[PDB]
């Protein structure tokens, strides 16, 4: 009995009877705070405690799973630091925005330049959202991380037309893009089930900030940073902010992000897209 099977790479053991020499042809069987990263730092005194996505910290690629023979670069200070993005003005009918990582930082800083000169990319991310309000403001924001977020299309509304979203929507860049039908998230999936993935609630009466640490999640250790988007970020105003007349109507939403444990490989020429 050679070990060719699919379940023989895990830590769980199963009992199975097999009448052939291949284990995959067998049967089933019995089943058994202040964050300082690099040159930048942040202090969040109003923020809820940090939510670690799937209970794992970002770390360097081990030699067991690493298939690349090149020795990667680790520019710790010039790569991993807090990157502040543009602010999104909130309105009562605002449907929410979404960003595609790691497509936002491709044009920004040393991280963006080395990403164009390197074919292989692996890093962890740090998600931070900032929305400020006073005691007279009542609202709620839902900040969630959905791995492999695919954009759909209404197909003209009839359903008989085959159309795909262009590169502007699938690759919004640094500025981001806005949701059309937040109920389906343009995935055809309910919004009420979005909390199954790592999420954090921003309630303007208590916590005005959010922090989520998302590690690297892919079926491959290294992957191209330009084409493949790892996960998206969703800031959805579930409860519309309400304020009476005379109060300040401009409520910004600031999203700052940082990479963690970045490794680059395959030094090559300049490749934009």
């Amino acid at each position: 009995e050679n070990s060719n099977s699919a379940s023989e790479g895990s830590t769980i053991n199963y009992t199975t009877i097999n009448y052939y020499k291949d284990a995959y042809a067998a049967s089933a069987g019995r089943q058994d705070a202040q964050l300082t990263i690099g040159n930048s730092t942040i202090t969040t005194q109003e923020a809820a405690n940090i939510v670690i996505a799937y209970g794992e910290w970002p770390e360097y690629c081990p030699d067991t799973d690493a298939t690349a023979v090149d020795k990667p670069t680790r520019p710790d200070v010039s790569v991993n630091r807090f990157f502040t993005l543009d602010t999104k003005s909130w309105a009562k009918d605002s449907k929410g925005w979404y960003w595609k990582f790691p497509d936002v930082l491709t044009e920004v800083g040393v991280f963006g330049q080395n990403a164009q000169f390197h074919y292989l990319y692996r890093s962890g991310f740090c998600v931070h959202v900032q929305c400020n309000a006073s005691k007279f403001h009542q609202g709620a924001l839902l900040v969630a991380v959905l791995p492999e977020y695919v954009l759909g299309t209404i197909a003209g509304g009839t359903g008989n037309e085959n159309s795909h979203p262009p590169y502007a929507t699938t690759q919004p860049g640094q500025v981001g893009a806005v949701l059309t039908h937040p109920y389906v998230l343009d995935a055809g999936i309910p919004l009420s089930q979005l909390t199954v993935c790592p999420h954090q609630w921003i309630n303007l009466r208590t916590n005005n900030c959010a922090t989520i640490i998302v590690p690297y999640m892919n079926t491959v250790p290294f992957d191209s940073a330009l084409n493949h988007c790892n996960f998206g970020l969703l800031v959805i105003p579930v409860v519309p902010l309400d304020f009476n007349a005379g109060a300040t109507s401009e409520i910004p939403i600031t999203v700052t992000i940082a990479p963690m444990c970045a490794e680059f490989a395959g030094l090559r020429q300049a490749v934009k897209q």
Partner: antibody, heavy 107, light 107 residues
């Protein structure tokens, strides 16, 4: 200089839809908001809605929430306003302006 | 929904004199107001921004002033090209409420 070029007049029977073009020139199209203003002859004036061409979000009013739909194109630097369910009271003069410090700098 | 009343609709002053137009709102706008000038058949033109500061290209005869909920617009002196319909805007809160308007004529 900054120039805003609209389209010409339109004549259509009630019940159809109409699209109006506004094209900015000499300024960054996705950097600033693009508003819309209706003037009802001759004494009425009110604000319609705005759009940010970078993201594409739309901020409407209470009455015009369901009637008007705003879209934008970053390639041609042009903003669109689509009206649905046109009636006799929906005939008026439409304006295209931009927001800078919170006022309307150019019409 | 902030109602801002502009009264009255019609007032007449001769040339070489002074004119005062009051634009009052319901709540405190934090001195954010924009006076407009629209000639018949043309688009509005900005004059005062923030109830005090001027624009570039606007003559110094236009001077806005005010405090609290009462804001005025003083034009001295009056000429033949300054006769038009004047407006006032509140950009402090959304939606932006435009003024009722004041049409000027010679007495």
């Amino acid at each position: 200089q900054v120039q805003l070029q609209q389209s010409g007049p339109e004549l259509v029977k009630p019940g159809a839809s109409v699209k109006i073009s506004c094209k900015a020139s000499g300024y960054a199209f996705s950097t600033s908001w693009m508003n819309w203003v209706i003037q009802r002859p001759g004494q009425g004036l009110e604000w319609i809605g705005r759009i940010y061409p970078g993201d594409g979000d739309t901020n409407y009013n209470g009455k015009f929430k369901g009637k008007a739909t705003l879209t934008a194109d970053k390639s041609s630097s042009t903003a669109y306003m689509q009206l649905s369910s046109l009636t006799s009271v929906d005939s008026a003069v439409y304006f295209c302006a931009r927001r800078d410090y919170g006022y309307f700098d150019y019409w | 929904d902030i109602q801002m009343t502009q009264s009255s609709s019609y007032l007449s002053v001769s040339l070489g004199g002074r004119v005062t137009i009051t634009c009052k709102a319901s709540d405190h706008i934090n001195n954010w107001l924009a006076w407009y000038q629209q000639k018949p058949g043309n688009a509005p033109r900005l004059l005062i921004s923030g109830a005090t500061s001027l624009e570039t290209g606007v003559p110094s005869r236009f001077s806005g002033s005010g405090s609290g909920k009462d804001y005025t617009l003083s034009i001295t002196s009056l000429q033949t090209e300054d006769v038009a319909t004047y407006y006032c805007q509140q950009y402090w809160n959304s939606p932006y409420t435009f003024g009722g308007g004041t049409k000027l004529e010679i007495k």
